[PDB]
Amino acid sequence: FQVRTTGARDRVTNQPIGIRFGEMERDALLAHGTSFLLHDRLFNCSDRSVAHVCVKCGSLLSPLLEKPPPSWSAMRNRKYNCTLCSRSDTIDTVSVPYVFRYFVAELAAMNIKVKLDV
Amino acid sequence: KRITTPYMTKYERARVLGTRALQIAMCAPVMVELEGETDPLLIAMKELKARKIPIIIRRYLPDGSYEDWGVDELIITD
Amino acid sequence: QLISIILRLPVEEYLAFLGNLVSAQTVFLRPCLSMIASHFVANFDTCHRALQIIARYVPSTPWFLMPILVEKFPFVRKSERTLECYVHNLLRISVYFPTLRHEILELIIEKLLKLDVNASRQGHPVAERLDILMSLVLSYMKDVCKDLYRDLINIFDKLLLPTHASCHVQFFMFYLCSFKLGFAEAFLEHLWKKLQDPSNPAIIRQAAGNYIGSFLARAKFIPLITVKSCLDLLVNWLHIYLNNQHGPFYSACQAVFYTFVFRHKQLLSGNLKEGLQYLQSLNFERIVMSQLNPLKICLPSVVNFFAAITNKYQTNPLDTFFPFDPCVLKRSKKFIDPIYQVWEDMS
Amino acid sequence: SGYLQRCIIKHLEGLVVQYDLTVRDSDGSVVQFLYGEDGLDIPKTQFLQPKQFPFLASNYEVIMKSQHLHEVLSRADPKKALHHFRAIKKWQSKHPNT
Amino acid sequence: MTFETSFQFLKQATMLGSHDELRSPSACLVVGKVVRGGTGLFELKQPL
Amino acid sequence: KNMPWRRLQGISFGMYSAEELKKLSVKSITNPRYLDSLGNPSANGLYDLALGPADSKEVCSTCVQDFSNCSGHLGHIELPLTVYNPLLFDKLYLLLRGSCLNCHMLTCPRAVIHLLLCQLRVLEVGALQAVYELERILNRFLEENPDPSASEIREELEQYTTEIVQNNLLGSQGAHVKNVCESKSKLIALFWKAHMNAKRCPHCKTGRSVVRKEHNSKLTITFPAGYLTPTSAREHLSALWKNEGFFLNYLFSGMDDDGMESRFNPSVFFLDFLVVPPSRYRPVNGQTVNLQAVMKDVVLIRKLLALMAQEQKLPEEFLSTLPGQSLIDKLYNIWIRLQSHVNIVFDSEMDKLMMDKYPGIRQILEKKEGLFRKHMMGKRVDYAARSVICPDMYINTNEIGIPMVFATKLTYPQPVTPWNVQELRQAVINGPNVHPGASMVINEDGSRTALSAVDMTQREAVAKQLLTPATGAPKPQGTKIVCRHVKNGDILLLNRQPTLHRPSIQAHRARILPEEKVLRLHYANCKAYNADFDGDEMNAHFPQSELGRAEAYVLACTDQQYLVPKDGQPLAGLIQDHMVSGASMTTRGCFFTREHYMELVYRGLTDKVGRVKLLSPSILKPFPLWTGKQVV
Amino acid sequence: ELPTYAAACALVNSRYSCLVAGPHQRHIALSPRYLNRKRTGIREQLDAELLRYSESLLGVPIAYDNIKVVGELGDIYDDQGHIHLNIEADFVIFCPEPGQKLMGIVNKVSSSHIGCLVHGCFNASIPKPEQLSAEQWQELEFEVFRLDSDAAGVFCIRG
Amino acid sequence: TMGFPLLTYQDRSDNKLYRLQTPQSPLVRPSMYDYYDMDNYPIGTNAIVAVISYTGYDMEDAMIVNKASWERGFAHGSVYKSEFIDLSEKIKQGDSSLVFGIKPGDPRVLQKLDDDGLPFIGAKLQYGDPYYSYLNLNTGESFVMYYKSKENCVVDNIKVCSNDTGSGKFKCVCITMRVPRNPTIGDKFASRHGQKGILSRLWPAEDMPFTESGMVPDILFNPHGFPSRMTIGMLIESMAGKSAALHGLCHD
Ligand SMILES: [Zn+2]
Ligand SMILES: [Zn+2]
Ligand SMILES: [Zn+2]
């Protein structure tokens, strides 16, 4: 009996290690017309993560949060920096799965950059 | 100028009674006199019967046009 | 980093060097108050004068001070002396800061909620720590005493009335509003407002009605005329309900019956006249003989006591809890022994 | 036959039905103007057959409690779409064979 | 890229630089998004 | 609180430039040793902590966060000599087999390059009425006067392709229709397969520098009157694009702005740096050893280039005995080995020879053991159990029996209101082993409480501080939510493989049957699931959030999934005993008496909220009797 | 001390005090417990926003009036109860620019610091000498070269 | 069929031996069953099977077993896991000095394993119990290994094995373990006429349809397993075994 709750996350694609929903069951849920049960079981339960995008460009591996300053929380900034553009503005958060952030960071090994229109 | 279905489809009823049940939960103000039940869906389904759910629905046409229907206006089937 | 080396050392020349180090581009004062707050665990009076000089040098540091009060609280597992000295220094800070008293009061009342719920009237070290902190805060309330009453009403309505099955946090309001008739009168006005408003949930209304009954039935500084007026307003609300027509109805009926049981002598004037106070026997004849039967939901010992008294005179978890007379016998003696009235319902 | 159904699924995943009752793809492309040439559903067409019309002529009042709205206002106004069924049934008495 | 031969339909969409606007049900669960199915075929408003 | 509201409304991808990734990277590796001998990750190596952390306890040395808060940082492997790009090697060969070295143009006729330039700027707008009109006017302008002297443009083609682009400009976003992308992929495919073949150069009228390709790693030029190096290929193809950038960028709508006026550069066909993926996206690996093979060959290249840069001998443009051609001091074989290792990095079918390979990114992405089928379209899910189904009939058709080995582990987060309190008060008092309901509660500001099952004071402490916002935050954003157990009305979502039609997943109301370890279904359900009771095992998905319960009541419910999508026949009935029992009860011979009719009717019904109304006798005298039709 | 409006803080749009009173629109992620009694949720969120740095309104606010919402239909998202709005608000803001004149109230005097206040609330850090002399020194006006906005609810000016 | 496999359970070291406690001989059987002496190792138990559709949990290849009869010993069994442990084929670091042993004063193995590293005999084991502890003699660093199986097992016998000469060091052992494995719900039965049932519901004995002779049944079999399967042979076997148990006969 493979009952699952707060399952352990692996290293690549930190999702349940777990019980499998399955690619053919997606099909039946789409046939019902239940987009939110499907959004729950795919996005909300397995591999939900936030991602920070520079909304002008749209890249996901372009932000770089700085280290905290050696002033020891004396005007600690803790901001994000699109070092492609050196600007610390409109780094907005989006909600994309972590396997998509592996697809973006593995097309990035293939010299392929993916814009996002936010 | 709104020419779409006068009736509330099943997917409309699902999203309305889901969001309104989360707009009953998360300590949100309940808008009907009740007897003491504890399930948000039964509250949100007894509010649909009493024409109390104030939601506007943006029924997107494929162009990008949207009509604004109120839940009060749409005839729900019995 | 120079501030971490200097501030970890703990007199007058060090205080002047501290002023020279905190003038000095005041951005760097963010770790200094945290390092002083880590040194809270004599020297405490020197810390008081130091914090006075730092926080009166610039006006932005009292507006900055409250996350340090949230974070640097010594834990519940820490001993009695540390918590006692911290609450004593925090009440001293509440003395010399007129603006920051509300944050201090809500922090102390939340922490005493967490120490009250953990000690559920003994079936024991945390109960003695609760006793020491309650006696210190009540000694503070005795030493100080309208704005204090306003802050306690606000944090009462934000914290304690949603908190069910309380045992000791309502004692602070109980000893505060017993000092003046107007404070208890405004507290009864606020409780009747929370019971009267239909937009509030019924659980809050029943907890407020239980607090109404517990305050009107177990207080000695309350006059009789205020109790008569509050019971008359409650019975008028019961008549407004029974004119056209359940939960807060039962809570108000249990509060009125609870007040009548614990004030069996004061609800009658003289030996026997042609009519008693507000026609209370005819009131019970028109309430009990209704078709709603409120005696089933109440506590059956209270119902049997009420039946015995009315014969001699011719939801449920929200109604279970009551403020408890027994406590820790270390430090809550000299507060509870003055204004407590005798139990057992002997007549 | 995992392969056939997988291919027909991923070539007909997008074809949802729109508020103007025309079946469209995931890019606005018009496939059909009425779904299935009359616009109906496959579950809800079971009792529209002439063998099951006496089930719906008896049991006539059991249905008209979720269906009160065809003796009162805002519906039951056929007079714009009933002129066509006098026109078509009038044209087919002057032109018998088409 | 999800159907078959995920390396050629990646390579053409890198050469031609293709957009999609994310209205396809296979596409909008690669990214986190509600499928425009029955309960994605509108969005939901409230007055005030 | 603290959640994204910024959505996405479109995606697009094209190649990085060689300058963009240099300032999107962080650290250069330069050390071919992926792990040390002590056990630590290697210092300035491939699992370096200057990239993402190689475990869950150590932190990153670029942004100081642990494994839970970071996402890794890109490094890069510097390449001292240029290799080809393994994605676009085929189109590079087709831009050399259709071009020549004498004149840096392409050997295609210019009667059709102008047509394709003239149409693929129309279909960028997506007019599509005039992809036949442009070839009609091309044929008419070519038949009324033959003119090969028209070298750059034609005025009669460009009048239309500047008329229907300046006019009808607002529809630059309605180009995603199937009829537009079908036509543009068709025209570009007809170009690359029909007008890009090797022919004698008609513009320079000289001999042809023929190129030819073998085993996806080697370009060889010929002699007009031989290993084509990628440095000379950069120096050749860059001149080709500086001559033909007006057309070779509307084939390649590349990096940005659809390649308008020579935007797409010859920088993506050629690579002098390999960006590594982040360290946490390759767990401790098959993809690290490909990069180590590349890096060891780079060490060999530096060993060769330190000896070819001698002040005695400088031939460039034993101590290393392991390279192949020990006769000549050139060693093109090392450089083609480096380009072959880069092919091993990006794929494993462009390699045909090297046995020390492990699969690259195509085999990670493509097939059913890939991403788009194993991890991106069907995911391993949480809050779902699996067990063997068994027959049952004294629960409803819209019901499932659930054991109390699943209702102690399957947890639903309920938002604490002042409306549904005093039920979650009892479900913190019980504690996580007792089922009227129990808990694993999380507080306001977002840390779990983890109430212990051995004590009781540390559970009533939580059971009284529930509704009170005892945090003291400046903004109230959210409430406490109690991880409630599953109770006797909740929907579980029930799955039986193969999921071949729409009633193969349904929403069944839970019913916690005590002392059991199997799931239970009514018999009407085991025809839609096509179940056979003989070891069939189902998945019991449990919707955590709250809009996963609304379609679960209204849409995915068993009650409305009575018909089949195929033709609309019923897929729910009563199977074996009941067709005999109702054929024998409702026969004309049955006659119950008054005590039995009232027992049968109340076995049929069960605790319905309502007065059970009854018929009258079919036979009133000599005995009150009820026929079996009257019970039904 | 509490910052009230009090006619734009007694009309300090005057000499040696640079500011601007312009409208600003922000983003609203509203808790759904305020679908009746709407205004106190908007001003309960905004009271946790004042007296610090932000992005839409640049420097720092001191007060606000007429907090109204643009558009009558709020944006309930897909799987969400937080109803989303956007509030226009007539803030009273001020920020130091390079080459401006500000307030000054002296606290003490040292060898390297002059402590000047900005409108009685914000602190301006000014070095005491201009590298000429540091012996004799007896409202102050100064110049701003950099700005040092703090983190938690306070604000500073490097002068 | 889980039957009686063999007689020499102690010197055999198979992976899984499915033993059936109390197997019986069939009262109705062919003559070949005795020509080969299949009563040395019989496979199943007789049962008083009624063919009635009494309950409703009794359909689509499922059946009902009396609960009292289950509690008295109907088709009780065992299953004998046997793990052959070597300390140089599985665990291999260096010097091959791995003997089973305990360091004196180890809290992991206190009163749960014996003084030599192997578990006790008769000792019940659960998930997460110590299972063997072995001692690298070169340094002294005694390890431990834990019982990583789900089911409850009882240690039955422990055989210490040398090599083929007789000079091997104490590093091989083969722990044999009983696992009881009674009929739970979801365990499958059958007959000798190819008609599987799955055990669906253990029905309490007072609820069973008792007969006119006093007897309850033992297994209830559905009359809807017959007409699509056409096993007349279960009818004649039922009459035949009833008439053989009533006469002391064994029927051909
Ligand atoms: Zn950017
Ligand atoms: Zn990092
Ligand atoms: Zn040429």
Side-chain angles (χ1 to χ4, degrees), chain F residues 114-115 118 121-122 130 132-145 147 150 153-164:
Chain F
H114 294 166
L115 182 65
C118 191
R121 196 174 70 188
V122 167
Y132 180 74
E133 183 71 27
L134 287 175
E135 65 183 1
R136 200 269 299 163
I137 65 165
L138 179 73
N139 286 119
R140 185 176 180 270
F141 183 77
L142 192 146
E143 67 92 20
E144 66 183 2
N145 47 0
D147 47 356
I153 57 171
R154 276 78 177 270
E155 68 273 14
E156 197 269 331
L157 290 173
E158 198 175 5
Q159 196 267 328
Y160 282 169
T161 192
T162 56
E163 197 269 328
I164 62 173

Side-chain angles (χ1 to χ4, degrees), chain A residues 11-12 102 106, chain F residues 34-35 46-47 277-293 356-359 364:
Chain A
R11 294 176 59 86
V12 57
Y102 172 67
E106 201 69 27
Chain F
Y34 63 95
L35 261 294
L46 282 80
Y47 292 110
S279 301
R280 62 179 290 166
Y281 290 110
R282 62 187 205 276
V284 296
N285 198 358
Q287 296 182 359
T288 306
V289 292
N290 291 322
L291 299 171
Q292 193 185 8
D356 54 355
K357 63 181 180 292
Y358 291 92
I364 303 299

Side-chain angles (χ1 to χ4, degrees), chain E residues 7-8 10 12 38:
Chain E
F7 194 76
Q8 289 177 356
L10 179 68
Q12 289 184 358

Side-chain angles (χ1 to χ4, degrees), chain B residues 12-68:
Chain B
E12 306 292 337
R13 189 175 294 113
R15 294 194 74 178
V16 166
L17 272 69
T19 56
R20 190 66 182 95
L22 209 156
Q23 200 180 356
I24 289 298
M26 198 63 73
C27 65
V30 63
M31 293 177 72
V32 285
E33 67 273 14
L34 290 174
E35 291 86 4
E37 70 269 15
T38 56
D39 197 0
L41 278 307
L42 276 74
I43 300 163
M45 192 181 289
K46 288 189 285 185
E47 292 181 353
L48 186 72
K49 299 294 186 290
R51 281 87 63 192
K52 195 63 182 289
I53 298 170
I55 290 296
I56 297 297
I57 297 163
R58 285 198 288 125
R59 286 177 172 173
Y60 291 167
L61 272 79
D63 194 5
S65 297
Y66 61 93
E67 297 186 0
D68 290 334

Side-chain angles (χ1 to χ4, degrees), chain C residues 2-222:
Chain C
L2 186 63
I3 55 170
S4 296
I5 304 299
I6 300 299
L7 269 297
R8 71 179 65 251
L9 183 62
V11 176
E12 184 178 1
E13 294 293 327
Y14 182 75
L15 182 62
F17 184 74
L18 182 63
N20 196 2
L21 186 63
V22 301
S23 296
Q25 295 294 322
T26 60
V27 171
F28 293 100
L29 187 53
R30 295 174 65 94
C32 294
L33 295 174
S34 296
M35 290 299 291
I36 292 169
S38 66
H39 292 170
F40 286 165
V41 300
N43 54 4
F44 63 96
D45 288 329
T46 64
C47 293
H48 286 296
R49 271 84 57 86
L51 290 173
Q52 285 178 356
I53 292 169
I54 297 302
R56 272 74 175 270
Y57 182 74
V58 288
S60 66
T61 54
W63 290 350
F64 182 72
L65 192 63
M66 60 90 71
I68 301 167
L69 273 70
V70 173
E71 183 178 1
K72 298 293 183 182
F73 180 72
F75 289 161
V76 181
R77 292 180 179 90
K78 300 287 103 175
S79 66
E80 296 178 353
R81 180 67 181 271
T82 300
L83 293 174
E84 184 178 1
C85 291
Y86 183 77
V87 173
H88 189 195
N89 291 319
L90 188 62
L91 290 173
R92 181 68 179 89
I93 289 169
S94 179
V95 171
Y96 66 86
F97 286 162
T99 303
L100 293 176
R101 65 180 65 250
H102 182 74
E103 180 70 25
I104 289 170
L105 286 170
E106 67 92 20
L107 183 65
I108 291 171
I109 290 299
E110 285 178 353
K111 266 60 188 294
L112 289 173
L113 282 168
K114 290 193 264 77
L115 270 71
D116 192 8
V117 178
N118 288 318
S120 296
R121 59 107 177 86
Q122 197 265 328
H124 182 74
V126 295
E128 292 179 353
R129 295 175 184 175
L130 180 64
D131 193 2
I132 294 169
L133 295 179
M134 284 176 69
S135 294
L136 184 61
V137 175
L138 288 173
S139 179
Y140 180 76
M141 294 296 171
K142 188 182 286 185
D143 289 331
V144 173
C145 293
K146 181 67 174 66
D147 292 331
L148 184 65
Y149 181 76
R150 192 262 301 163
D151 290 331
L152 266 77
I153 288 297
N154 285 322
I155 66 179
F156 177 77
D157 291 331
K158 290 180 178 67
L159 298 170
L160 183 56
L161 179 56
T163 301
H164 65 91
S166 297
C167 296
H168 293 90
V169 181
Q170 69 273 16
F171 289 162
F172 294 103
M173 187 63 71
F174 183 74
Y175 292 113
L176 183 65
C177 71
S178 66
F179 290 162
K180 189 180 289 293
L181 191 148
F183 290 162
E185 198 273 332
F187 182 67
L188 291 174
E189 286 181 351
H190 292 170
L191 290 177
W192 182 65
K193 189 261 182 182
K194 296 299 292 294
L195 190 146
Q196 185 62 255
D197 185 74
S199 66
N200 289 318
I203 286 92
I204 304 300
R205 295 176 67 188
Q206 291 180 358
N210 291 318
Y211 287 159
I212 288 169
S214 296
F215 182 72
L216 292 175
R218 293 291 91 193
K220 291 179 71 68
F221 284 165
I222 190 72

